[model samples]
Each structure stands twice: as structure tokens, then as C-alpha cells.
Target chain A: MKISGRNKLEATVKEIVKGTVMAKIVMDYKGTELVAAITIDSVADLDLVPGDKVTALVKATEMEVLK
Target chain B: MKISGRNKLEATVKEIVKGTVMAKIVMDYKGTELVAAITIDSVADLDLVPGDKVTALVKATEMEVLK
Candidate 1:
């Protein structure tokens, strides 16, 4: 799907930590770890697993920088 | 303010690109550039400008990894 977010990072799935409603997907991005919180349903929909290759997407509006 | 999102990167503002209703905040993180799209109202609320120090916040749920 086409997205408007400007930041896209190629990353490798490192782990999946699932909770009741939310899941945390940890990815390795060029030696840095990037974590994404997603729905458990989406995790199942994406069939995410460790060592899988994926692209991380974040919308510009969803990105917040605090002073 | 404390947030639930786990990914927080220390960044420095590089530029602010304003549009009609939204603005793009360009930042430098360890030599890598990260961009955030936010509302013009937020830009004014935060009083963001070049050379300012800020923390980039992205919620886990807002982050998506495509297979």
C-alpha cells in the first residue's frame, strides 16, 4: 500500500512480544533496534516472525518530537 | 509529558517546512536524518525552529512493518 509517511526503514524482525491486546515487534535496523507497537490481530495478519524481512512505516503526523 | 510509546530518539532540529495545514520537521539523529510530519498548530505550540533540541516520539501502534 502507498503511504504518505516520509520515514521508511528497512529492518529485520528480531522478536515479537505479544500481550492481550497489543504486541511489540522488535526489529534490527543497521545495528539499531526499532520497536513497533501493533495490534495482536495485525501481528497475525502480517504473520511476523523473527528473522523476517520487513519495512517499517511511520506517518509524518504520527511522528512527534518534543522539546 | 510521559508517553507509552517505546521508541524515543534524541534528535536535533535541522529545518521546518510549513505547508497549509501541516509541517514537516527535519531532524538529525546520529548523522541520520529523521523527518516528522505534524500539524501547523503543533509547530506553533512547540515553538519549533532550527537548531533546537528535541525528542522524537513514535508510538508503537502507529509504527507498521510490512512484510
Candidate 2:
């Protein structure tokens, strides 16, 4: 699907354990093993698996750090 | 419930209408009405409403701005 004005991390979904839905995606960025866990139920119905390239959706509006 | 490393905005939940699960939350920062729309299903806890003060938890790990 085409999303407008979205900054995405195009990377391989390194791990998608069956029992646990949380995934660890290996992007081409600095953090290859950086942890980003979302519920398997939160997958938006997409079929994800290890070695499958996926887009980690990101928006500037969703960017705000407390520190 | 209390959380660690959760920086929160103690503000009101401005609006929550039906027909759409997305909500418009109001945080009492500089831009009190700065839009923050999250799916109703995404809310983890607490009943929300307008003029009702609540906390918008933010984490440094979730922080990043695109340009």
C-alpha cells in the first residue's frame, strides 16, 4: 500500500517467534538488533516472518522524546 | 497504573466520538490542543473523556524526529 509522507525503515524482519508475536526487525540503519516489539495482534493482519523485508512505519508527529 | 521512565502530559482527553475509534486528545503542554489521535482500541487503560485530565506517557526510546 502507498502511504504518503511516511519515513520508513526498509529492513528484514529477523525474528517472528510463533508463541510470541513481538518481532525484531533488522534494518539497514545503525541499530540492526534494536528491539521493537509490537503485539502479534497488532500486526494489522499482515503475514510477517523471519528474513521477510518489512517497512517500519514512522512519522515525525509520533516523534517526541522525554529527556 | 504507574510506569517507569514514562514521561507523561497531565491533560484532558478533549474528544471521543463514535463512528470512528480514533480519538483527539488534549495534553496541557504549550500546545494544549495539539492533536494526538490514537485508535480507541489502542488505549491501554482508563476511561477517557473531554475536560477529563489524563496522562500522555512518553518515552525517550520512542523519540525521534524526521528532519
Candidate 3:
């Protein structure tokens, strides 16, 4: 699917932490760690689990550049 | 300042596109290009311009993982 976000990183899922409404997906991008918080429904829809390969996408507006 | 975002990428500012309410910041991370949208007011407050060194930050909640 086409997305408007400009940042994309290939990563592997390391863990999933689910809350009442949100789920945190932890991943390893290269040697660094990346985390994404998505809806619990999305977690189920994506059928995510440990050791799965995935792409992390972030929107430009949802990002900040520190100087 | 301490932020909640987990993704941080060091990049160099390449360009800035401004509008009435928002501004787009283009950056180069390693060899890849990254873009960020921020408030026009933030553009002024941050004093951002081309050729500056910056760290791009994205929140865990503002990110998505595609399997």
C-alpha cells in the first residue's frame, strides 16, 4: 500500500505489549531498537508476533527534528 | 528537553517548505532522505534553516508497523 509518510525502516519484531486500548510493538532496526504504539485491534489485524519482519512507518507531521 | 518518542535519527537539514500554517523540513539521514512537518510557528521558534544538523524524532504512538 502507498503511504504518505517519508520515514520507513525495516525491522524485526521483538516483543508485543498490549494495553486496554493500545499495543506497543518493539522491534530491532539494525542494532538499534525501535518501538511503535498501535491500536489493539491493529495488533490483531496485523497478526504480529515475535521474530516477524516488518516495516515501521512514521508520518512527517508526527515527527520532530531536534537541532 | 526530554521527549517520549523512541525513534531518533541524526540527519542534516536539506530544505524547508513553508505554508500558511505548517512547514515541511527535508533532511538527509545517512544516504536516505527524511521529511518532517511542523507548525509554521515552530519553524520560527526553532530557527531552522538549510544545512543545519538535527536529530529527527518520532513518537512510538505516531508510528506503524506493516508485516
Candidate 4:
């Protein structure tokens, strides 16, 4: 999908660390790894899992991902 | 809600510029402004509108928002 945000990175889910309210998700961006933290509800809403293909979108001060 | 991503900014929607496949959303973070571009589908799914209270979530490499 096209977005105005620059710095898109192709990523693969590498790990997930679930918490009470938030989850720390690790993904391999190309060869480098990055992490995302979101609400558990969002994790469930997106149904994120290991090995998932995702696009990490970055702006000047923030980074978020898309499946 | 808490997320592992840092740089969470409490925001208010200021403007939305819609495109065929994407929408450029301008938001006011405190007094500063930031922009986010996401798929139009995502916009419709989220039903985003002006004056909405949102938490702008930013990871190290990407940024997304929570309503």
C-alpha cells in the first residue's frame, strides 16, 4: 500500500514478547532487526504472528508497521 | 494503552488529505504537528476523523497510532 510516510522496510516477524497490556514484537527488517510495541488488543486485532510478512513505515519521529 | 514502542504522543487530528490509495493525515502532537500516511483502506477501517483523541505510537523505525 502507498503511504505518505517514508522509510518503509520489508520485515518478517522474528519473535513476540506478550505482556499484560502491551507486546514487544521483533521483526527482521531486511538483515537488521527492529521491534514494535503495541497494545495487546492491537496484537489481537492484527493477529500478528511469527513469520508474518509486514511493512514497517517510518516517519520523522515515529515508526509503525503494516501487515 | 501501553505499547513497547516509545515516543507515544497524545494527539488530535487536524486534517486528512485523502488519495486514491492512501491518505495523508496531519495531527497535532501537543503543540507540534506531525503527519502520517496510511492506506485508504486503513483509514476507512479506522474511521478516522478530525478532533479525535489518539495516541501516536512510534517505534525506533516506524510510527503508527492508536485510538
Candidate 5:
């Protein structure tokens, strides 16, 4: 229904708020959509919405999504 | 082993070449680290290095990482 990637990434900002961002950057890798919380400064900075086109930028020595 | 998230995201841009972008973004979740390919314009934009800090940006109907 969407022109998104073969994979999908979606989620809502739970336990966090706008201005002070806290969103769940869920990634649909293969068949397992893992969820992680992204805490940024402002929603404007993140440009997040219920269904806005965005990507989760991840980088570290190590990182992963867990339940 | 590093001061990264409880997870890990790392990889080298394979397949595609410079001026373009493609890197296997791996995430270490729990005991499983899933890998995915990232295609951007330039590595400079990604600010990626052997041991740099980055997060994968995902936004789709669904997303996940699998073996």
C-alpha cells in the first residue's frame, strides 16, 4: 500500500514527547520487526509523524533491537 | 565491548561503489545480530568509519533483521 522499501520501519513515540523526542524506531528486517527507542531533541529535528517517510540512523560499536 | 548501545550496528559498503552508497548495517540484538544493506549518496554524509557511531534509520510498514 506504500512505496516504501522492501523492508519497513514504523513506530510511535511512546514514553517520550515532542521537543524532547522519544520514538520507537521499529525496523522490519526479514520478518522480524525489532523496536528501539530514539531520543532526540525535537520532533521538528526528527521530522516524525504517525506515517512520515523517515529512516533510523544507527551506528555504534554494536547495536540491535530486542524485546 | 564498547560504549555503544546494548546493540551493535556495523558493516562495510559492498556491491555498490563510491559517489553511491551501500553498506551492510548489522545489529546485534540479544544474541543475534542481523545485517542489512544501506544505500546512501556518500560516506561523508553517513560519517561512517571502522568504529564510528551511527544508527540505521528505518520507516516502513514493517522492518526486521534476520539471518
Candidate 6:
């Protein structure tokens, strides 16, 4: 992960609210709770679910995903 | 910038939409458009605006800020 922007956190998928267009994802970064709203397609691509260990990449623009 | 987490990008403030609890910030991350929703007080503290050079610190828990 070598780029320019800074700010990433290791998080766990706690909940998922699937909407028509966007899906709201709730994550736990250590003890901190955060929310991310992304496209439903992205949700499908990631196949996200509760208890998944994920690296949340936040760039003020979007949360780019990785395995 | 040394941290366990990765994913960082250089960006510039382009727009700000203030809300009662949260404010939406649109930014240009090296020609790529990005957005962030933060607190209104954080907006006032940063005194953000279009053309302001800033580092959009995004995390799963939150989009953290810096001066």
C-alpha cells in the first residue's frame, strides 16, 4: 500500500444495510465504530458480511477495497 | 507518514455541504473526485473551503483531521 493519500484502518464488518443504490456498512476499527455507504455493486463484489476482517482504505474520495 | 494502515492520496478541497450533525465535503484527489462527510464543528475548526489544500484522512471509523 504505497500511494500518496493517508488514513487507513483495520476494521471488522459489524453490520450491513443493503439499499437499492447504496449500502451502509458498519465497521469496528479497534473499539471505534465507523460507517461507510457504498454502492450495492461494491457490496456484492466484496461479498462483505459480519465478522469479516477487512482493511478499510479511506481517501476522502472513496473507500477502495482489497481482500 | 508511518503507520500500519495504508492507502493515502493528495487532495484539494472543492466543496463543503454543512449539516446539523454532519457536513459533506467534496474534494479533488489528484484529479479524482472524492467526498467526505464530517462534523460541522470540524468544518469550522478547519475553516475549510474550495481551493484549500488539505489531506483527507479517512478511516473506517471516521475521516480524521489535521492542520
For residue A14, model 3's alpha carbon misses the true position, in angstroms, by: 2.1
TM per prediction: 0.75, 0.38, 0.84, 0.47, 0.29, 0.46
Tell me the tens digit of each residue's lDDT in model 4 across A36-60: 7767766776778899887765543
Clash pairs, candidate 3, are: none
Prediction 3: B-chain TM-score: 0.89
Residue A27 displacement (Å), model 4: 0.5
Q: Which ten residues in a row have the lowest lDDT in candidate 1 chain A?
A: A1-10
lDDT of 3: 0.88
User: Backbone collision count in every prediction?
Assistant: 2, 0, 0, 7, 29, 6
Tens digit of per-residue lDDT, candidate 3, span A34-64: 8898999999999999999999998888888
Error of 4 at B20 (Å): 25
What Cα-based lDDT does every candidate model obtain?
0.87, 0.56, 0.88, 0.71, 0.37, 0.62
Give me the TM-scores for chain A across all models, comma-separated.
Answer: 0.87, 0.56, 0.90, 0.78, 0.37, 0.79
TM-score of chain B of 5: 0.39
lDDT of 1 by residue, A1-67 (tens): 7777777778899999999999999998777778998899988999999999998988777898888
CA-based DockQ, model 1 = 0.65
Pairs that clash in candidate 1: A37-B60, A60-B37
Whole-structure CA lDDT of model 4: 0.71
Question: Which candidate number maximizes TM-score?
Answer: 3
lDDT of 5 by residue, A1-67 (tens): 4332332223232222333445444444333444545454334465555434344333321222211
- Going through the candidates in order, the fraction of native interface contacts each one reproduces equals 0.87, 0.03, 0.88, 0.07, 0.00, 0.08
Kindly list the per-residue Cα lDDT of model 2 for residues B1-67, writing each as its tens digit. Answer: 4455456676666666522334356545555564575544444345666667776766656656898
Which residue pairs collide in model 6, if any?
A: A4-B8, A4-B9, A5-B8, A5-B9, A6-B8, A61-B34
Model 2, which residues run further than 4 Å from truth? Answer: A1-67, B17-21, B42-45, B65-67
True-structure RMSD for candidate 2:
10.4
Question: DockQ of candidates 1 onward, in order?
Answer: 0.65, 0.06, 0.73, 0.11, 0.06, 0.08
lDDT of 2 by residue, A1-67 (tens): 6876467777666654332434333344445643354556655467766666677777755654444
Q: What does each candidate score in C-alpha RMSD?
A: 2.7, 10.4, 2.0, 9.4, 11.0, 12.6
Q: B33-66, model 4: which lDDT tens digit per residue?
A: 9887776766676677898777675553344568
